Design a protein around this ligand. Structure first.
Ligand SMILES: CC(C)(COP(=O)(O)OP(=O)(O)OC[C@H]1O[C@@H](n2cnc3c(N)ncnc32)[C@H](O)[C@@H]1OP(=O)(O)O)[C@@H](O)C(=O)NCCC(=O)NCCSCc1ccc(O)cc1
Ligand SMILES: CC(C)(COP(=O)(O)OP(=O)(O)OC[C@H]1O[C@@H](n2cnc3c(N)ncnc32)[C@H](O)[C@@H]1OP(=O)(O)O)[C@@H](O)C(=O)NCCC(=O)NCCSCc1ccc(O)cc1
Ligand SMILES: CC(C)(COP(=O)(O)OP(=O)(O)OC[C@H]1O[C@@H](n2cnc3c(N)ncnc32)[C@H](O)[C@@H]1OP(=O)(O)O)[C@@H](O)C(=O)NCCC(=O)NCCSCc1ccc(O)cc1
Ligand SMILES: CC(C)(COP(=O)(O)OP(=O)(O)OC[C@H]1O[C@@H](n2cnc3c(N)ncnc32)[C@H](O)[C@@H]1OP(=O)(O)O)[C@@H](O)C(=O)NCCC(=O)NCCSCc1ccc(O)cc1
Lengths: 140, 140, 140, 140
């Protein structure tokens, strides 16, 4: 579908003693790529959607990920994000992460399908909402 | 199978603007719970296994997670980890994360199945190895 | 002054390729130790103080830190926090971080003096407030 | 002195419940800016210096920081780093962090002076070394 791309440089601190990117760092980047996608497609930042419509963001409900090869500091990641499927109150966001060998080869580092929802905070309780029509059209 | 339990207190900084735990923090805890399991079952720390046998740790290759309810600063998480299945060069580590209502009810926060492998660093190249027999027996 | 102590276990992911704790992790722990101090001294969590009195927390305004020796995964940190001085709208929180050799020797890892303030969010603008008298008495 | 500039976009996950950047995130960026400076001045990555000369990186020994105004997700940071003073086995790296109002005004967010050293790992023991002459000339 409608795909957005973003780059992310791996820093020394993003790596573990094993010398490679420590996994939960991938989830930080995927979360940034997730929101970037929305931004880039025109939605306002949560700061604003929360004022205007109660939308605090798009919390994750499910994830399937696979880590194909390692990455390390200085490698520069290219992330590809698109919405793979709209559902009632959820949506599947797909991300492909790769890096580029100096051979100009594009190695797949990781991939992940995130199931998220648009949510509101009903006081202390988080609540999912019907995907907003406006949102679907924007991201379309 | 053989299950280990660990607690984790959520800090203010572990939360996002939405007031709840920011997801990639769960992966940090799951990674700590993963190693804790091994430690608690008797294996030496990677620092040592890398010297003795080249084993740098247990990198993740795949993950399936589901986020059932929200959690926030001050909540105290209880994580349950066990190895669900041994395979040839991989293993499935299962984690269940919950928190306790003051009603003494144990709410499930999240769950996740991690597919990991024992690996070595062959110079700059990460390589999986056959699950060590000794390891299986220890964790058994 | 009134001192609170807390322990913190270093995880593999808290370390960098150099094999030691990556510094910004110390600041996460100091921030947890900062709030823990307040909690432990009786104040309500920010979640509540923000409702009751607008107090969103105690943002940092200044810091002086020194890193005395290294620490790594599995080391267990003991943090000592106290308020070194109350000022008008600020306060100096001091932390001492150490670890224990197996010789039972208590090595100093790091130390840091944090200057923080009680703050409110006046809409999008963060604002410091006069240290609350009640707070001084509680922490005293 | 010789100054390098870098940009850093603040992500939603870099913020706390208070809606602003959680401080230890500044230290991650300063650490990236620190190494970026060296890279940009021509030194090889630690991965390589450790092979060639044992240099594992530039651990921090001391820091003085001041947080002038708040920053939040979507703000884009501009970091300015330079070496303020060479010493025997240490060096003072200075960073200035700012953001740009839409008025085109450049607000100072934070500043920090980091005292670091070039270090080697003598087995499990970290050791500082005399600033390498070559390094001084490169960064000069
Ligand atoms: C999100 C929430 C409140 C939704 O529960 P709910 O309001 O009762 O509504 P619901 O059960 O119908 O779920 C909404 C939709 O998501 C779908 N969904 C929910 N769980 C799953 C799952 N495990 N797998 C697939 N789809 C799912 C539901 O089927 C439903 O579907 P529909 O299209 O058929 O209508 C509940 O799942 C929850 O709290 N999960 C925990 C969320 C969380 O804490 N994730 C970790 C932090 S994410 C941080 C973050 C926040 C904002 C951002 O901008 C980015 C990151
Ligand atoms: C791990 C490595 C090198 C293995 O590739 P390989 O050496 O060619 O061997 P391999 O393909 O046979 O895989 C080994 C086993 O894992 C299984 N496996 C590998 N990928 C998957 C997958 N996507 N789903 C399920 N099982 C998988 C393989 O089937 C194989 O199975 P077997 O039992 O049937 O023999 C390759 O998958 C890789 O580099 N993945 C990237 C790993 C990574 O960077 N994860 C992110 C960082 S994790 C940080 C960390 C490090 C140490 C720790 O202690 C903790 C955290
Ligand atoms: C905090 C705030 C709004 C205060 O500015 P203000 O409202 O105009 O008031 P102010 O200038 O009088 O400062 C209040 C007091 O702090 C003292 N102070 C402020 N800056 C400094 C400094 N650099 N060195 C020493 N003391 C300082 C001031 O002198 C003043 O003192 P006083 O006792 O003599 O009355 C302004 O400094 C600021 O925004 N700094 C940025 C704060 C920030 O973003 N830090 C990074 C994130 S911390 C995340 C966090 C949040 C909540 C938590 O529970 C924990 C962590
Ligand atoms: C770094 C090390 C081993 C140096 O101790 P040492 O080998 O006995 O040598 P030393 O005492 O002469 O210190 C070397 C120079 O730094 C200066 N220095 C050391 N401590 C301080 C301090 N508190 N304030 C100012 N300068 C200092 C020393 O005076 C000395 O100066 P010199 O120019 O007059 O000769 C010891 O301070 C230490 O382990 N500190 C802990 C370091 C640490 O764990 N920081 C947290 C993690 S940083 C992670 C990181 C790693 C690599 C990177 O690329 C980036 C981040």
């Amino acid at each position: 579908a409608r795909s957005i791309t973003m780059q992310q440089r791996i820093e020394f601190g993003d790596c573990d003693p094993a010398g490679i990117v420590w996994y939960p760092n991938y989830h930080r980047w995927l979360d940034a790529a997730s929101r970037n996608y929305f931004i880039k497609c025109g939605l306002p930042p949560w700061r604003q959607t929360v004022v205007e419509r109660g939308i605090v963001g798009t919390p994750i409900v499910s994830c399937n990920a696979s880590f194909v090869c390692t990455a390390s500091y200085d490698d520069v990641l290219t992330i590809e994000t698109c919405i793979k499927e709209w559902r009632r109150k959820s949506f599947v966001q797909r991300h492909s992460v790769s890096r580029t060998t100096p051979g100009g080869d594009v190695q797949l580092v990781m991939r992940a399908d995130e199931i998220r929802v648009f949510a509101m905070n009903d006081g202390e309780r988080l609540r999912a909402i019907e995907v907003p029509a406006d949102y679907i059209e924007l991201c379309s």
